[PDB]
Amino acid sequence: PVWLLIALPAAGATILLLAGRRSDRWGHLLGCAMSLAAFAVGTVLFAGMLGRSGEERAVHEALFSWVPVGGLQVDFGLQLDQLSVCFVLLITGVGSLIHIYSIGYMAEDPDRRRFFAYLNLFLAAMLLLVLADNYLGLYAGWEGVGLASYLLIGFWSHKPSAATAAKKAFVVNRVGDMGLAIALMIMFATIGSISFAGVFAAAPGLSEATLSAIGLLLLLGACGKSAQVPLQSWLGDAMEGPTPVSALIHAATMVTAGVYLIVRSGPIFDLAPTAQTGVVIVGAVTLLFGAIIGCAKDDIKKALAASTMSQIGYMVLAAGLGPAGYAFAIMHLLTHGFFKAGLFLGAGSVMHAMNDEVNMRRYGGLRKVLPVTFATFGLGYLAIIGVPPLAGFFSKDGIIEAALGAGGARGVILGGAAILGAGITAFYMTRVMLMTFFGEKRWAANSHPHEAPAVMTWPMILLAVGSVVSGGALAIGGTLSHWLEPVVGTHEAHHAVPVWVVTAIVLAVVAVGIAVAYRMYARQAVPEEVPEGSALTVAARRDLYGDAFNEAVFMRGGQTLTAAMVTVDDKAVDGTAGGLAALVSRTSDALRQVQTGFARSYALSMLGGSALVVAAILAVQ
Amino acid sequence: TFPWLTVLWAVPVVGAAVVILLPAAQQVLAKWLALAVSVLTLAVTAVVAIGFDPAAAQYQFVESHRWIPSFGTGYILGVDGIALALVVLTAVLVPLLIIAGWNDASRQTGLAGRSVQAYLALTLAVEGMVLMSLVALDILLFYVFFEAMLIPMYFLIGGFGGENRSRAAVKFLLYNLFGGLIMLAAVIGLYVVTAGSDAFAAGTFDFREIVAAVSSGEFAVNPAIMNFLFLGFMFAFAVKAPLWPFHRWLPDAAVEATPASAVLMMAVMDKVGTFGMLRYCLQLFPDASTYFRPVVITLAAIGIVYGAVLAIGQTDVMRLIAYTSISHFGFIILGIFVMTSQGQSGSTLYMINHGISTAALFLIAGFLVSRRGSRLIDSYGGVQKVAPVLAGTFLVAGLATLSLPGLAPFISEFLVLIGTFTRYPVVAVFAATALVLSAVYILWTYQRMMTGPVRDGIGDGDRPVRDLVPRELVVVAPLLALLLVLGIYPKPALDVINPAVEHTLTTIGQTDPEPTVP
Numbered sequence A: 001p002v003w004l005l006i007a008l009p010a011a012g013a014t015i016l017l018l019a020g021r022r023s024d025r026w027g028h029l030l031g032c033a034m035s036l037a038a039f040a041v042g043t044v045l046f047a048g049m050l051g052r053s054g055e056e057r058a059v060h061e062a063l064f065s066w067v068p069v070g071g072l073q074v075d076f077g078l079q080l081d082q083l084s085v086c087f088v089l090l091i092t093g094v095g096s097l098i099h100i101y102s103i104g105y106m107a108e109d110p111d112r113r114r115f116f117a118y119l120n121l122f123l124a125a126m127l128l129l130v131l132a133d134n135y136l137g138l139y140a141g142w143e144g145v146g147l148a149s150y151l152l153i154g155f156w157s158h159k160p161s162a163a164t165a166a167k168k169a170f171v172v173n174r175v176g177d178m179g180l181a182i183a184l185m186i187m188f189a190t191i192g193s194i195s196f197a198g199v200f201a202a203a204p205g206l207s208e209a210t211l212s213a214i215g216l217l218l219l220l221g222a223c224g225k226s227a228q229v230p231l232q233s234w235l236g237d238a239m240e241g242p243t244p245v246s247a248l249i250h251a252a253t254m255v256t257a258g259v260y261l262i263v264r265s266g267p268i269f270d271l272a273p274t275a276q277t278g279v280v281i282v283g284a285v286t287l288l289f290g291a292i293i294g295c296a297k298d299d300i301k302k303a304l305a306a307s308t309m310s311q312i313g314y315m316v317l318a319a320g321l322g323p324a325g326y327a328f329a330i331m332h333l334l335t336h337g338f339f340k341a342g343l344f345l346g347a348g349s350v351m352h353a354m355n356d357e358v359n360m361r362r363y364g365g366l367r368k369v370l371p372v373t374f375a376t377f378g379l380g381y382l383a384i385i386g387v388p389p390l391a392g393f394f395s396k397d398g399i400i401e402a403a404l405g406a407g408g409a410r411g412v413i414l415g416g417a418a419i420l421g422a423g424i425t426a427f428y429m430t431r432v433m434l435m436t437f438f439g440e441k442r443w444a445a446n447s448h449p450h451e452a453p454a455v456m457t458w459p460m461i462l463l464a465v466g467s468v469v470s471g472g473a474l475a476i477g478g479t480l481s482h483w484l485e486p487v488v489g490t491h492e493a494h495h496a497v498p499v500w501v502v503t504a505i506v507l508a509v510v511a512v513g514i515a516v517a518y519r520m521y522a523r524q525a526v527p528e529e530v531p532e533g534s535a536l537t538v539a540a541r542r543d544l545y546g547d548a549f550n551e552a553v554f555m556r557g558g559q560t561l562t563a564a565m566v567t568v569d570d571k572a573v574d575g576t577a578g579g580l581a582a583l584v585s586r587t588s589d590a591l592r593q594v595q596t597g598f599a600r601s602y603a604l605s606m607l608g609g610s611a612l613v614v615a616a617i618l619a620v621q
Numbered sequence B: 001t002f003p004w005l006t007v008l009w010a011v012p013v014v015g016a017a018v019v020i021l022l023p024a025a026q027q028v029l030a031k032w033l034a035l036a037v038s039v040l041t042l043a044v045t046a047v048v049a050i051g052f053d054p055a056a057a058q059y060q061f062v063e064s065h066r067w068i069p070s071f072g073t074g075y076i077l078g079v080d081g082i083a084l085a086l087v088v089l090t091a092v093l094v095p096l097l098i099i100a101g102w103n104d105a106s107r108q109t110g111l112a113g114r115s116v117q118a119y120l121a122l123t124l125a126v127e128g129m130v131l132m133s134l135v136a137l138d139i140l141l142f143y144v145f146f147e148a149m150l151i152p153m154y155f156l157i158g159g160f161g162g163e164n165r166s167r168a169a170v171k172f173l174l175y176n177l178f179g180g181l182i183m184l185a186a187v188i189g190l191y192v193v194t195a196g197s198d199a200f201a202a203g204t205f206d207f208r209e210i211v212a213a214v215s216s217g218e219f220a221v222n223p224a225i226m227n228f229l230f231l232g233f234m235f236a237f238a239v240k241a242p243l244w245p246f247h248r249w250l251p252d253a254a255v256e257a258t259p260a261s262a263v264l265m266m267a268v269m270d271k272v273g274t275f276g277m278l279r280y281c282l283q284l285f286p287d288a289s290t291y292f293r294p295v296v297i298t299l300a301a302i303g304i305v306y307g308a309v310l311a312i313g314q315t316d317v318m319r320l321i322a323y324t325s326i327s328h329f330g331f332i333i334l335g336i337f338v339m340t341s342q343g344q345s346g347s348t349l350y351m352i353n354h355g356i357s358t359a360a361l362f363l364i365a366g367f368l369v370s371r372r373g374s375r376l377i378d379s380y381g382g383v384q385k386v387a388p389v390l391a392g393t394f395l396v397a398g399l400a401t402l403s404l405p406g407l408a409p410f411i412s413e414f415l416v417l418i419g420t421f422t423r424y425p426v427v428a429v430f431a432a433t434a435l436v437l438s439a440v441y442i443l444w445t446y447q448r449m450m451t452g453p454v455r456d457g458i459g460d461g462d463r464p465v466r467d468l469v470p471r472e473l474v475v476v477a478p479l480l481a482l483l484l485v486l487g488i489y490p491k492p493a494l495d496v497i498n499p500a501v502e503h504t505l506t507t508i509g510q511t512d513p514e515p516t517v518p
């Protein structure tokens, strides 16, 4: 049954958490086994769907009624459709490879069992995300992926940076979660259904305003997950966690969650031209800003984070292209899950060889010291750059072709931004690749490397292969589109300008960026001290000041609100009751003074009791 | 015909009577006997729930006897879906709180050696009186027990607590009793109104008859009198279940009282406020509730955000959890007073989930506070290293109070938020921000405590933070188990609650608004 795909890893994680330290010796084996079982199950189901050609290819379980309250009647259903199967395969394969790599990577660390527990929980969460056929289960998987990202990012709790990064990531993801919750509330209040089937069937009757609101809030949720502006700030800091966590989050499951949300809600976006405009704007902004950030990132992890942000921005732009770019967006998302995952595995190998060195400017010449890891990183590098043999090249060409076909000034601006993103990506990817594999040794202390064990090698080699394979395997003949056609809308091939000229321009800009990078470091050197590029470079090392924008407007303002409300509580709410108490006490003292103890004073009060006489006499009038 | 409901509430009180009457030397036997009485009450609850048919009539296990005809009140019990849910909550919690406060009364002196017995008997009396309130279908009987249960907890706070126990106990009792006395004014006004109307044979307190009369329209009364009586009920239920302005007492008491007693106050007793709001305020005063619905909705949402913010600003663990519970009470009241089937059902399930979640989170924090005798958040750090299981359970509890779907509370908050959107979308968004605020005050707290380098005296010295003991494991495991189960499969509890919510919404002339699309 389809639900097994969700059931397997979660149950695994459950044991990995319920068994405790008693499983420290063998837990990793169970975690990797459960991930591999999920991959096998997904492949089997995909084969079954291939057998059920045409219609009826999509699985749909509808296990049980989940929250049958009033008119909600949300059932805990599942839909492994032609779109969902792609994400299932990507997540399972990349996560299994990352688990296998983490075996060696986390071998020396205690709680390796706990780490694999968290990874299996993450895989379960992402699978539930992509497999739910209604937005309630999608939200469940959404928040589950958020929690898993928190837990894994926070691994190595002794590091305050790890804890802070986990907190920031989860809180930004929670802002995204609030956005998605408002989206669901609108969907229910306007349709009364939360299922994909019902929502997408009622969508045509929805007004442009309701659709715009829903699409905008879903795009906000994606920005949360996929780390688009203004919630893009959390991508960089998360790298304080283990390299495999970054790999899984950025390449396959966590980062791609927003792209998946946009693709699945595609019926909403296509029906919300304003929502599509917002999605495109967010994609362009994220792509450009992340590329500029990567232009300065000196830490391998930080540079990879910027690269992931830029790639996710490209995917968001393509998806906001609507049916035109859904197919290319998903194809690039998968090719990315391959090549960026391989890049992260290679970076982890470099760090493990560099005694946990993070700074790219603190090492080099590794291509002559880590040949297999260097080769895997280089394959993922040729993929992300976009060489014609590379997978990423085909996907990026498709995205840019859709952008160009977008027409008008809007399509031209989008295409130019995408081209500039390609150029900047090439520039900083070149800087990184030269800085580690090429260049002077630049070793620190012992820095005595070695090719990571076979357990690490095999996943990295497979990710490199999937970077060389795929992209072409999904773009040649439009097989990916013909697969997504039944469930993902296809409008037409605009053919505004020949694909040849677009591809030539892409290659030219990639080469121009590569040459700029070479003149920067190939002819020049990799200085140990801060290169000090000044201006944007400075602003670029501070993530375009983006964190400060949060720290200034929100953190400072949030603390202002907190202190203000604390004052209100202690002084207004408590103060009113205290003032009433003080009034009662003062009045009690004043009255008690009336008992002077002189019997003649008491008698005077009693004689003034002629108040009674006068009142009774006046009661006649 | 068996007095299932009567025995349900009688057993805790009789058990308290036996316990307090034990010889001081039988302290261990007293603990065990109190736990046994709690478990017996839970078994009674189990049979009552199993025999209860949510597809059947609104009120079941109805027991009726004449108690005080002169006041028009009779000993009438009957459990509906909502009352059944809260009864199950109280019953499942009370034994766990007992095994949580196992040693809470050890370091007390005096009481002729009965401090342990007094603690346990007070806990049992609170449990039984809360049960009597829940299953009472007589307005005056319910008010009796609702007001009286303040006294056992007033003692439980004052004795068996920190230095400010006297002050916090006084503030708690006075706030709550002032509310209860305002509700007494309202109760007497209701009696006068019923006596003044031809719908009843005489001044009546029978809740079912009054509800039937107000629904049938025969009991037609001036909207002004109804407004004032509704306000009288509302003030007491708001101070009990803390609606934003009136919450002020709860932080101090929850801080000062021992963790088991604080949880008994928040998770169980404060719920009775919202319960009353759901049973009486809406079903006695539908027109007044509707008229005041916007203002109370505003107060509840402001309470949500305000409690979240204050919890963020709290340096004290216990104060933070208390304000978190206040925000959750804002959620519950919002969901109850939106008069939407989604809303009311979600707020009932939210009473359940918040009870369990706050119990777990607050008891875990109480264990942590016991390990090192400081309630200040800054006093901790890197506890996750020394006590991995404590940190794991604390994180799970926080996630629960954080409304994460993998756990129960989300299913309810979601339902409430959804409900609020169909009638007050602005308020719904205003409350939804609490999803972010919860992440803030939960994860920041966990970061400050469990993560980072181990603080001084944390893993060493005379005040180390040792991991959870087996007894704490017994306390904690069932709570997280229920959270998981209700998050994954709320279907049984929702199926029980929905018939009662539908009955209530039919009673007050309200219905879930139709979807925008035709």
Ligand SMILES: CCCCCCCCCCC(=O)OC[C@H](COP(=O)(O)O[C@H]1[C@H](O[C@H]2O[C@H](CO)[C@@H](O)[C@H](O)[C@@H]2O)[C@H](O)[C@@H](O)[C@H](O)[C@@H]1O[C@@H]1O[C@H](COC(=O)CCCCCCCCCC)[C@@H](O)[C@H](O)[C@@H]1O)OC(=O)CCCCCCC
Residues within 6 Å of the ligand: A159, A160, A161, A162, A163, A164, A165, A167, A168, A171, A172, A175, A230, A231, A547, A548, A550, A551, A554, A555, A556, A557, A558, A559, A561, A562, B312, B433, B436, B440, B444, B447
């Ligand atoms: C609709 C509502 C939207 C509102 C969302 C925002 C909510 C809260 C804002 C702040 C926050 O969201 O959270 C930061 C602190 C935690 O402060 P911290 O102390 O935990 O971490 C510090 C760190 O110090 C720790 O970290 C180091 C290293 O580990 C250790 O050496 C130290 O010892 C110590 O441990 C370090 O030293 C300090 O310089 C830093 O301030 C560290 O925080 C920093 O916060 C900044 C802001 O964050 C955010 O994401 C903002 C989220 C905004 C999301 C919306 C974006 C636009 C959306 C448009 C639709 C970032 O630049 C980094 O997040 C960085 O991390 O919360 C608080 O104060 C809350 C106080 C009141 C909040 C009330 C809100 C109403």
